Design a protein around this ligand. Structure first.
Ligand SMILES: O=C(Nc1cccc(-c2ccccc2)c1)Nc1ccc(O)c(C(=O)O)c1
Ligand SMILES: O=C(Nc1cccc(-c2ccccc2)c1)Nc1ccc(O)c(C(=O)O)c1
Ligand SMILES: *Cc1c(COP(=O)(O)O)cnc(C)c1O
Ligand SMILES: *Cc1c(COP(=O)(O)O)cnc(C)c1O
Ligand code: NA
Lengths: 315, 299
């Protein structure tokens, strides 16, 4: 029972993938290699971004940085914008998202529906300019505040305090944690928590390939490195092709009934490579991986529909 | 922790609608009239149909209709279609969806995504012909089985054993339950449970403007026009940050009437309403923004 939708977030299920796992059962050919999917679409707006959105706002509040009716300014499109829009609306704040004018429409659709306003910054300026614009705009008014998910430790804290502890509790035998590398909040926070608490644990990134746009799934330009990022937290980072990400996304729903967004496809590709390695090594693995959101908002890319080739060109 | 996604079904949040409720706090003007939203889009496939679909397969197993290597046939292409595809597959069965050849591509592509085999019946006869066709198909083989969601008591039981207990747990002060009237499983199952346990509880249906149905369960019944459903759906996302399907707008219309009525009478209310699915698949209609009349036309 929750007085507010804000509280109905986190404590997400960890689900075993009995069919997609390289080897679910221990046996004569060697120990189990299991995949466990953490379902972060079970959240207020359907993504993992509800965690850092809410914590960034509450931390801003505890720090005395917000006041009643304040306007939040964030250089984002996509899930974080949705998450902040919901949260801002429920706490009496306004939200303005800043994003490049050439940002994919699928990363925009629901924003005005949840109450947000959009500033469009110069397409050629890219990420760099959208961030600098939100930074400038925030300085116009004491009422206007930029949370900046790429550098706000409350992003990382949501995972250190939420995603991590839940994974420890549900999967004390964890050998690997795999997730997408975007703001880096999920891997930095969950990774730092698990590394402190689990002996020998590996932390593995998935990310897009350099040179592939996959625009409907990307918030930032290839070169940009979030200030949250700490290259010492990761054990490995793997680039995943669009064809492979889409293939795995279709595989997950077809085989395990879990309808996920495309980044989950990339994560699963990474987790399966990690898994094939343990299997060829004769080693036990229990690999937890993050389902960041559901496939719903990505249908209009055609990616779930026809051939893998067209899906690639659509991306 | 779950070995199977099927185990992550149910136990959905019940969430206060503080802004949208007629009166959240007991006031000087009288006692609170609260709205509480049961978020059934939190289920595995994103709708309430996960519950009856899983229970129907279990009951069919218990009844000795489903044995290893069986095939399930369902003549439906909506939320139950999806729930059954997900569940049949995880349970080890194949699923065939029998559907009119002119079913929207969106519906078909989603069933295929979840691994359903499709068999096309003729456009002419719509859903009736697809039902009749699945019956004929099932009769050809013992191992091939149709589950009858509209006539199947396991549907109702899933709410008597799931939705109901969960509601009473989270809202023991409940005065009204409000949901849509389709198969009638939700209202019949949940409503019978709540009536056996909560004295004076009201069970209220929302339904469109002009079997498991039991005439004795409902206390009230609201017919809702498209404009009202649509406008309530928008208000819910705009005001409460909950992005819900169109049937939720209808439910919300009924629940607000119920609420206003309690408010006028100065009675204390705790009204639980079902959010059966999310807005994703209704988004293309254009319903969530712009002209209400255009949303009505887009259906
Ligand atoms: O991090 C990602 N996407 C991502 C992460 C990892 C892998 C992939 C991927 C997608 C398609 C093919 C290959 C990789 C995509 N997106 C992202 C980053 C920051 C954000 O704020 C948001 C967002 O709010 O929507 C999304
Ligand atoms: O019954 C409904 N929807 C519903 C219920 C009550 C009211 C309304 C409604 C929607 C718009 C305007 C007015 C009423 C809609 N859906 C339903 C019923 C049976 C089903 O098998 C399915 C399904 O499988 O997708 C959906
Ligand atoms: C944010 C996000 C990621 C990346 O997560 P970070 O914690 O930002 O690194 C991956 N996939 C989806 C869908 C996201 O919304
Ligand atoms: C099934 C369904 C209903 C009606 O529920 P019943 O239990 O069939 O009466 C309402 N809304 C949506 C979205 C559904 O899928
Ligand atoms: Na048969």
């Amino acid at each position: 029972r929750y007085d507010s939708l804000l509280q109905a977030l986190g404590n997400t299920p960890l689900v075993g993938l009995q069919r997609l796992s390289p080897r679910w059962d221990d046996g004569r050919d060697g120990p189990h290699v299991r995949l466990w999917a953490k379902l972060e679409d079970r959240n207020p707006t359907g993504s993992i971004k509800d965690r850092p959105a809410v914590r960034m706002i509450e931390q801003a509040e505890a720090d005395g940085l917000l006041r009643p009716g304040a306007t939040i300014l964030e250089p984002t499109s996509g899930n974080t914008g949705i998450s902040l829009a919901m949260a801002a609306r429920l706490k009496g704040y306004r939200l303005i998202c800043v994003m490049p004018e050439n940002t994919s429409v699928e990363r925009r659709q629901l924003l005005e529906l949840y109450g947000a306003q959009i500033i469009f910054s110069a397409a050629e300026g890219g990420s760099n300019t959208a961030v600098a614009t939100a930074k400038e705009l925030a300085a116009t008014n004491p009422s206007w505040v930029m949370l900046y998910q790429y550098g706000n430790p409350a992003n990382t804290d949501s995972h250190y305090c939420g995603t991590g502890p839940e994974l420890l509790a549900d999967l004390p035998e964890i050998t690997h944690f795999v997730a997408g590398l975007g703001t880096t909040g999920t891997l930095m926070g969950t990774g730092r928590f698990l590394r402190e608490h689990v002996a020998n644990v590996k932390i593995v990134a998935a990310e897009p390939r350099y040179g592939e746009g996959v625009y409907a799934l990307r918030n930032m330009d290839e070169g940009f490195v979030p200030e949250l990022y700490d290259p010492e937290i990761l054990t490995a980072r793997y680039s995943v092709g669009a064809v492979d990400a889409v293939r795995r996304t279709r595989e997950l729903v077809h085989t395990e009934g879990i309808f996920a967004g495309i980044s989950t496809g990339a994560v699963l590709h990474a987790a399966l490579g990690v898994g094939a390695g343990a299997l060829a090594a004769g080693e036990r693995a229990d690999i937890a991986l993050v389902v960041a959101d559901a496939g719903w908002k990505y249908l209009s890319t055609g990616a779930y529909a026809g051939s893998l080739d067209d899906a690639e060109t659509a991306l």
